[PDB]
Structure formats: structure tokens, C-alpha cells
Point group: C6
Chain length 219, copies 6
């Protein structure tokens, strides 16, 4: 990654063993559960494109997912190239060349070039650009691997309401419902899919009930 030292200049540091191991293990333990994404983003704070490739490449399973991710990355790279075409022909001696999609994705750029872009004034933030493409890809994967439709999350006759809501919102997160929909579901699908007893209590609370109020009601 690129970090500020204790004196305030932006320099390259090696990715740490603790970072490498954290990411491998989270993938091992959680696969593409949705909370893996924010972990990825945090573990790659300051990453160069080289670093981002390192983290993805150190993953041993999930190779169907990694191939899908490559496809997504190529799509975004191709759109970058449409928006930001680069000059063919030789570089001005000693000067910074402009990055193409494949330079952002780290496949045609050197570590030195990446550093040069990211520490330019002002920065050409190739690490952040590539990270956004990667996350775009990873979210598609999360959605793909989500095993259950929200329509099939229904409260069991003996299932505590709390346990049911946990299942409901865990499913909506993986299915990647917007926050509008997450904020709205509380007045609709969450009640409809509740068991008869709690459905009756919830119906009676009336509209505009907070989730806290609904959960208290069905305790």
C-alpha cells in the first residue's frame, strides 16, 4: 500500500503478512457472505493495483467466482478506455504516461508506474479506481451466491420473532435490496411473512411502527 510515513510523505509499504492472512482466512471461513465485501475494502486500505491483485490471487478456491470477477474487471476497463483514450506513440522522456484500463487493473503497469500515479499532485488514484471495479464485481458474486429469495423467509410457528427478522434482513442484504426497500419492508413483506400470532399483533400496531416497536410487540 501507499502510506504516510511518520514525517508526512506518501510512500510504498509492503503488504503485511497479517493483512494477507486475514483476507485468505475471511474467504475461507465466510466465502461470499455479504460482510466479506466491507472486510475486503478495509483490508485493502491504501492498496496499489498490484496489492489488489495479490489479495485476489492468494485465494485458492472459488475459481468460478474469480473468473466472473475478471470478466467484470474487463468490462469496466473497456468502459474506462472509451472515456479516457490514451495517446499512441512514444512517451515524453522522463514523463508520466496516462493509464489505460489494463494499467489500472495492474496487468500492463509496473509497481513504479502505479506509485507514480497514486503520488502525483494531484493523484491519479488508480488503486481506488480499480478497487471500485473489484467491488462492483464482488457484489455480483454475493448476489449470485445468495441461496434464498426473500419470498421464502417466513417465520416459523415456534420461531422467535427476533430470529426470523435476523433471517429476513440477512437475506435482503445478500439479495442486495436497496436501503429504500430495507427501510420499507418493515411495513410490508416482514409483516406478511410473520407467523399468524405475531402477524395479528403487528397488524394491530398500525402503520408507522419502527422495527424496535415491532420487535418489542412480538417479544
Amino acid at each position: 500500500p501507499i502510506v504516510q510515513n511518520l514525517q508526512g510523505q506518501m510512500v510504498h509499504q509492503c503488504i503485511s503478512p497479517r493483512t494477507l492472512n486475514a483476507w485468505v482466512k475471511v474467504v475461507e471461513e465466510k466465502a461470499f457472505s455479504p460482510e466479506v465485501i466491507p472486510m475486503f475494502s478495509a483490508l485493502s486500505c491504501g492498496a496499489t493495483p498490484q496489492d489488489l491483485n495479490t489479495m485476489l490471487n492468494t485465494v485458492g478456491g472459488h475459481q468460478a467466482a474469480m473468473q466472473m470477477l475478471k470478466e467484470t474487471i474487463n468490462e469496466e476497463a473497456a468502459e474506462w478506455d472509451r472515456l479516457h483514450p490514451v495517446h499512441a506513440g512514444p512517451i515524453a522522456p522522463g514523463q508520466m504516461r496516462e493509464p489505460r484500463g489494463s494499467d489500472i487493473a495492474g496487468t500492463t503497469s509496473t509497481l513504479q508506474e502505479q506509485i507514480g500515479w497514486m503520488t502525483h499532485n494531484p493523484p491519479i488514484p488508480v488503486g481506488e479506481i480499480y478497487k471500485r471495479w473489484i467491488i462492483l464485481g464482488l457484489n455480483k458474486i454475493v448476489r449470485m451466491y445468495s441461496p434464498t429469495s426473500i419470498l421464502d423467509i417466513r417465520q416459523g410457528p415456534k420461531e422467535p420473532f427476533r430470529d426470523y427478522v435476523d433471517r429476513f434482513y440477512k437475506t435482503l442484504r445478500a439479495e442486495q435490496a436497496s436501503q429504500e426497500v430495507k427501510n420499507a419492508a418493515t411495513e410490508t413483506l416482514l409483516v406478511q411473512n410473520a407467523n399468524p400470532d405475531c402477524k395479528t399483533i403487528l397488524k394491530a400496531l398500525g402503520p408507522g411502527a419502527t422495527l424496535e416497536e415491532m420487535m418489542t410487540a412480538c417479544q
Copy 2:
């Protein structure tokens, strides 16, 4: 987080793998037992709003709780906006814009803006403001998930007094009794809910007994 380097300027550091892992694991092991809150506060020492979101987002279960927390955060954000309305229309070139509720909660502000606020002279402490909202939310959750009323904590006939008081005060903490009430209960509910034998000893000590004195008495 924002830290002082070894030379005394306030700079942004990446959230560490050890921090990320600590929080995930405490949640995994303790859920919303009350001691989780002070751990959260300590693990997020110096956090930006981005960092606070990271820590909350890396939590994989408890999604009913995380939705309730969003609701709390929106409420506080809306109150911030009532108290501190911001100018519509374009920013003075190169100048710091004022933060709205959603900028404090990190949903409409960039990391760079957050840093700018938090390292201004004097600071607009957006990390601390958002942390307070989050903790407000988390305490509601603790109270919600508290499984037992203090009225149902009664000393067993063979239950050592110490074990009973531990249960009593653990329950009061989760139910979020004030310190007035915690300091007062020792002369009332704690005696009433004791077993017959210890109740008799405690009754005889007379009023004004310390908890240490009560515990010694029923040893």
C-alpha cells in the same frame, strides 16, 4: 483512524487487521451483552465515520439489530439537521463545506471531507458525533436483547450469595438501570430477592450496609 504521528501532526491511518478482527470476534462471542459497548468504543478510538461504518458493516449476523441501529442513526441525523441546517448552493472554491447528518454518518461524505473536518482548527469532530449516535443505538439493542427482568433474579436456596449478586447486577446492567438505582438496589430489591436464610441476616445488619458488608454477612 486519525492519529498523531511520532512528530505531532494529525493524520489518517488505515484501520488495522487486528482491530477489524477484534470487533468481529467480540460480536461473535458476546453478541449484545453490555460489555460489548465499551469494547466498541475502545476499538474505535480515533475512528473516522468511514471507520465506524466499516466496523458495523463487517458484522455478518445480527441483521435485525443492524437495521434497528440504522433507524436510530437516521433519527439522530434528522435532529442534527434541525439544529444545524446547511447552505444550499455551491461551495466556496477550495473551502470546507458544513456537514449534514448524513455526512456525519458517512453515507454522503468522502474520507477526504471527514479528515478535513476532523483535523480543522478547531476540529468539527464528526467521528465522535457519529460514535455517540451509534452508541445510543447500541444501548437500545442491549436493552432489547436483555433476556430477564430484575424482578426474576432471585437467590436459590443453595445458591451462594455471591453468585446471586453477580446475576442481579449483570441483569441490572443489561436492563440499563442508572447508577442511582444500582447504588440504591442494595438496600431494597437485592435483600427482598435473597433467599430466606440470607434475607434474615441482611435484615438484621440494619440500613446503610455496604455491598461488601452484605456479601461478608451471607458468606
Copy 3:
């Protein structure tokens, strides 16, 4: 805590995840065995009052003990206030206010105030003052939770002498005998409570025997 950076000024650092975890785990594993106290003292080296509260608050069990500790802290705070009354009425603009008991215990003071006191020239060492109160409290707890009187530590007929002395001194430590008494017991209670065979050997060594000499004798 407050630390010296690599350049020699006194600055605030976040309490580390390793520190937080160390303390929680020592409490989990050892409860209020006496060696917990020196661990507490070492883990809170440089602590502000905020830090000390953090460490105590992160403890999930032992709530009877934590309530007793609050009582002790209030007692010491009240004695501080008797010895060092503070001016009512408004603070001199920009100047340091004097700390009350509850400011030392971190309940009415901000982190910024605490830092200001502790890094004043010369320091008002609020972290060390509060730590002493806490330890005073913790020692009471150790003594309370000590399960056995020294009078009931007697050497078994087949019990190796070494194992017996270990039990003896472990018990005296928890019961909080002075070092005078620890240094004296070797000529008295330790012999009296030994088994017949070793009692005879010890009696014959005569007075002024070191513990090393006594232990060699009964090997």
C-alpha cells in the same frame, strides 16, 4: 495511555487491541486470584482515567465485584474532595480547572481535560491517583474471594512438603498477610501445620531456619 513518542513529547495513544484482549482474558481465566492485580497495574501503564474505565467496563462477569469496586472508588473520591476542595463558579477563560474526585475517576472529566492534567508541568497525575483507588478496591475483592483461611492449610500425610508450602503461601497471599507475617510464618504456623514426620524434622532444625533449609530438610 499517555506515552513519549520517538521525539520525547507526552502524547495520547489509543489503547491497543492487544491490551484490551489481555485484560479481558486474564479476568476470564484467573478471576480475582491475587496475581491479577499486578497484571492490571502493568497492562494499564500510562493509562488515563478514561482508559482505566475502559478496562473495568470491558469485564462482562463479576458484576458484584464491579459494584463493590464502584463503592470503594466513591469513598476515595469523597476523601479526595475533603482534602482538595475546588472553586465553585466559572473557569478562567482558557485555563486548567482543578480536578474533583469524580474528575479523577473519569466520570465528570473529558479526555481532553485528563490529558491536560497529566501533561501539565508539573503533572497532576490523575491516571496514577485513580489507579491507586482502583487497586485499593481490587485488593478488597481479592481478600473477599479468597476461599480458605490459613488455619485450614495443613500438610497431608502423603503430601510433599513443597506442595504444602505452595498452598500455604498462595493462601497467605490471597488473605493479604503483610510481608512481616509472610517472613515470620516460616518459624511458626508453617511448622505447626506441617504433617507429623516433617514437623519432627523441622522442630529439630532449630530456630532461624530459612525456607530453603526447611524445604531441603523435608525433601
Copy 4:
């Protein structure tokens, strides 16, 4: 390794215990699964040739592989010597000698010489040169230890499509198919080797289907 200190000069640091242990353990757990290579590359970020030898030498098993790697390294060294012959006869007093193949591989050069080369202006990057030779060798090993031809990866009658694609791409990675071939296989061998039911669905999608589309289709 050679690192930038907090002041911006290039200096030698000892290889860390965490690094040493990481590499030994990844080899212990994964042998020459393909994801071991990018881990090696990341764990040896900034390595001198001495460091690279350390990491290889600390491996206790896999000695057939380590012998094959020596052979590869000798081959590359011999090609370096063909391209970059060095002056026989004595060194200019106080001046930097040019590196031979065996100096790059760390077998005839001292740590001091290695440092001198790598921190020259401009650097003679002996660590990166040797790392490339090592990786060249390691990839041969991965391919050698790959247990299954891609022709034998066929979807089971009850095998979920996702699980089959994971097997397929894991195998192609170890067999070291190019990215052209990985990007192409999706329209050919992957369909042919699918089970009858999914083969029919895939055939009907038509050509130009993304892997995401294929995977959705056979869900």
C-alpha cells in the same frame, strides 16, 4: 528486505519472524497449489537474494521440488551470464563489481554486495531478477504437481454447476492455461464437459454468453 525507513532512505531490515512463519506454514498447508505462488511473491516484497534463499531453505519437505527449482535457477543464471558477461581480474578499489548469475542467486555474493547493488542509483535490482527466476521455477512445479487434466473435469449428474465450474477453473489454473484459453473455455470445453441437463440449457443460450449468464442459467 530492503525498505524505506520513516525518513525516505533505502535500508536493510531483518526478515521478520512473522514472515518466516507465514511462508513455512503456507507450504505446509497448501504445498504447490497455484495460490502459493502469489503468496510467495507477496511475502518476499523487497527481498534480497539472501532473503529469497532463506525462505526456500526453511522449507523442510518437498525436496524433489527444491532440487528441480535449483536446476531452473542454474539455467536462468547461465542465460544471464551469456547476456551479461563480467570482467575477469581484480576489482577497482572501493568500486562496485558487476553481478554474475550466481551473485544474483545469492550463492557467490555477500549481503553487503547485494545491498550495494539494490540501493545503487539507479538500482541493479538483483532481488527482483532472482525472484523472477524463482517464480519461473515454481510455476513449473505447480504444473508438475497438478493432479488432473482439464479433460477429466466433468460435471456430475447431481453436481451443482457452480461446484463443477470451481473444479474446472481450479484445474485450468494449476495446468497453467493462458488467460486467452481461460476466457475462451467458457464457450467450449466448459459446455462440452457439463452434464446433459445443463448442457442443453447452455446450448440454447447461444454463443457470447458470459460465465455469469451460464451460471445463472444452470442454477
Copy 5:
């Protein structure tokens, strides 16, 4: 401990959680096996007397040993006081007082005084002095807890010679034989205590055999 910062002045650092935990665990796992001593010495590199007390106090078992150690420390302290008597009466304002035995052992000196002594020019190395007393004490303990005389280490009829020599030298180390005796035993007791078969081979090698030669002979 007292350390050199990154700028070259001698300053006080907090004892680390990793250090505290290392020592507790080595004692837990190895008790007073002889190799515990060099671990103690290394873990307390740079220690103040306060730090040394911390490490000893954090030990929960072995209280007979800790009492014996106190006795040893008092003996050395008393000898220090005989050799280096201090002026009674008040300290020169602002000046360094001379350390008594109990100031070296950290029982009558403050951390600030300890630091003042240890960073004086030239240093009064109170940490190293106290460490020597402690080690003197610990060696007595090792010897006390050594379970077997060297006279009872005899090679079994089916016991490999190597395993026998390991037992022999492990025992001599705990019994604290000098290096003269360790270097000499190879020509005497080690042969005498060997089994008949290896005794015959060893006898025939003749005098002046190295341990390597003896071990090869009885392989």
C-alpha cells in the same frame, strides 16, 4: 523498560502485553526447568526494578519458590547496604539520592527514581543489579526443584545412547554442575553409567574422546 528511541535518547517504555504473557506462559509450561532462567533474562532486557517486580508478581503459582526468592533478595540487599551505606538526613534539593538495597529491589524507590538512576551519566544500573540478585535466587530454586541426582542417570539396556546422554546432561544442567565438570564427565561418569555394551565400546575408544566420537561409537 528503558530503551533507545529512534533518535538515540534513553527513555522509559511500558512493559508490553506480549512480554507479560510470554513470561507467565513459560512459567506455566516449564516451571523451574533450567532453560526458564535465560528466558527470564531475555524477556527482562532493559527492565527497571519496577518491571522485574511486575514479572515476578504476575506469577500465580510457585509461591514457595517466590518466598524463597524474597529471602535471597533480602540477603543480597543486605550485603549491598554493607558495601554501600547511604547518608541519613535530607536530600540536596533537586539532586539524585543514592540507592539502598531496597531501592534497587524496587520496594522503597519510585519509578521516577529508578529512571533517574538508570539514565544518569554514567548510569547507576539498578535494573541490572537487581536482575543479578533475582537470577542468583532463581538458580537456587532450579537446583532445589531438580528431581534426580546425576548418580541415578543410567543408561537402560535398550535405551539408545543419545537418549541417555540427553538425560545425563539435562540432569547436570539442573543440578548446576560447572562447565569444568560438564566438560570432564564425558571421560568418567558418563562412561560408568552407560549400559554394558556401550560401556565396552567406550572403554576401547581410549581417553580424549570427544562427545561426538562417543556418540558415533555407540550409534
Copy 6:
């Protein structure tokens, strides 16, 4: 060890708990398997003689090996003294004395002297000299503890060739065959000791086959 700080001067640092623990554990787990040696060398990067003694002394078993190592060290020390005799009689006030063998081995020199030698301009590298003696000793031990002659490594009738070559080269490493012999064995003993079926294939490849070619052939 002696390290470069973040400002570029050579200073003494305490050996870390992580280093101490790494070495003890590698010895516990691997004994004197050959890969232990390069681990030792790496873990003692920058070591003073004091540090080297620490690492050796913290080893609790293998005392026959540690005695043999002492003997080796005395031999090298005695040869140093033959080559580099030192002046008897008093040191020039304030000046650096020359190191004898026992000063290099850390038995008659102080830490301060060691530091003085190692940070002299130019350095008298006593840490590296002693490390070489130690490694010389350790290699003898590896060879001694090697359980099997290369003549007894023969391929089983159902033993995969790869598994056989691993056994072969693991044995040659412990027996400490030169690289000439390791590079040569592939055309001789490795074929002769192969099973009949693979022996026939190998014989037919003809001379000059790489190990990669041989291994492919017998797959």
C-alpha cells in the same frame, strides 16, 4: 540485535518475545532436521554474541547436542586464538581491547564490549564470527541425527516416484551431500534405487535427463 534505527545509526535492540518463541518452538517441533539451520540463521539476523547465547540457552531438551555444540565452539575459539593472539597487560584507558575466542563466544565479553566491536568503523563483526562457529556445530549435529543412509532410500513397488525422490533428497540434505553430489545423483544412485518399472523408463531416457524430465517420465 544491532539494528539501524529510522534515522540510520547502528544501535542495540532487545531480542523480541516473538523471536525467542519462534526459535524455541522450531526446535520443539523439528529438532535437528536440516531446515532448522537456515531458520536459526534468519531468526538471529543482527544478533550479538549475547543474543546467540540466549537463543541456544533457551532450548530445554537436546542437551547432548548442546554439549557437542560447546565442544565445537571451543575448538573454533581455540583456532581464532592461534590466528589472532591478543596483548596481555592493561588496556589503554578508554580504548577498545581486541577480542579473544571466548569474547567472540560471549562468555568473557560484556554486552557493551560486543556492541563496541560490532559498531566500530570498520566493524569487528563478533556476532557474525560466532554465528559461523555455531552453524558449523549445528551442521555436525544435523549429520549426527540423520537417521538413514542414502543407500537405504529405495523406491517401493507401489511408491509414487515423486514420493521416493522427496525421501531421497531429504536424506541427502541431512547427510550433507555437496551440491555437486546432489546435482550428480540424478544420473546415478537415484536411478539405481528406483523400482524396476521406473528404472526401465529412466534407463531408456538416456543420459543428461533433468530431474523434471525423470519425474515426468515416471508419472
